Design a protein. Structure first.
Length: 282
């Protein structure tokens, strides 16, 4: 009954009202507007909350779910790549989790540039990519890891760990087990990198807008939100945070579409159930 169909129908009812409420109007002041006609959002109706936006020219948002601080974004457009790399380096990114699949990146129709697996130059920024480990996550899903080295004349050179999930388990107990394994890997990768910065006395440790994990799929609202939900449930600081609370917080801080599909919410419900974590606010 706490996790039964009645409770799930009530949770879905609240979250649907919230999505409808957050739907962008034309020139909505809640949302980042493109200036001059340059494409900002990769999808028209998947917009970027202005007050938590990381950069004026990116579809990317600071997200805090309970105590867990991240950045969720869309897969950068080709025109956004230099700005994207500057965000990653400025943030001192302890891990970048890419949940777009290999076959989606390869599909040129999608306009997803292969920016973390290839070396190249983007304006004055130079990027080197070195593949490191590969970690199985269950049911044949694989994470490819990379060290992404970002160089720019007169800027501190920054190296970003990358966790690339090459295919995705859309639904089921499989998705739930794999998500939990991915959350642990991403959080472990970030802790190792953050520890390095702390051991070198980096001032970035002081700034809570910095050292955040950066997560994106294609739109940054589906697979991305399912991962962020799992990571927040892995944080020992977030006891008694409800699934309602955590999805509502994601939606107010990025857009109403966070947790896009019923199958993604149901993974989050199952993880909460395994923890005895409440679904609803009382
Ligand atoms: O690349 V996602 O369509 O599951 O926001």
């Amino acid at each position: 009954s706490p996790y039964g169909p009645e409770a799930r129908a009530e949770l879905s009812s609240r979250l649907t009202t919230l999505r409808n409420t957050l739907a962008p109007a034309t020139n909505d002041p809640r949302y980042l507007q493109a200036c001059g006609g340059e494409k900002l959002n990769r999808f028209r109706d998947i917009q970027c909350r202005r007050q938590t936006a990381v950069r004026a020219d990116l579809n990317a948002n600071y997200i805090q779910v309970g105590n867990t601080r991240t950045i969720a974004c869309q897969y950068p457009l080709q025109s956004q790549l230099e700005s994207h790399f500057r965000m990653l380096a400025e943030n001192r990114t302890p891990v970048l989790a890419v949940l777009a699949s290999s076959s989606e990146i390869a599909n040129q129709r999608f306009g997803m540039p292969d920016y973390f697996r290839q070396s190249g130059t983007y304006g004055s920024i130079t990027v080197e990519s070195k593949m490191t480990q590969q970690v199985g996550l269950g049911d044949g899903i694989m994470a490819d890891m990379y060290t992404l080295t970002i160089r720019e004349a007169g800027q501190k050179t920054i190296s970003v760990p990358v966790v690339h999930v090459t295919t995705w388990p859309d639904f089921g107990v499989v998705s739930s087990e794999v998500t939990k394994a991915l959350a642990s890997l991403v959080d472990q990768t970030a802790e190792t990198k953050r520890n390095m910065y702390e051991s070198k006395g980096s001032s970035a440790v002081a700034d809570d807008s910095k050292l955040r994990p950066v997560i994106h799929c294609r739109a940054g609202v589906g697979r991305t939100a399912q991962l962020i939900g799992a990571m927040c449930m892995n944080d020992s600081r977030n006891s008694q945070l409800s699934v309602e609370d955590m999805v509502s917080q994601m939606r107010v801080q990025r857009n109403g579409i966070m947790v896009q599909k019923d199958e993604q919410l149901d993974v989050l419900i199952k993880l909460a159930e395994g923890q005895g974590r409440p679904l609803l606010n009382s």
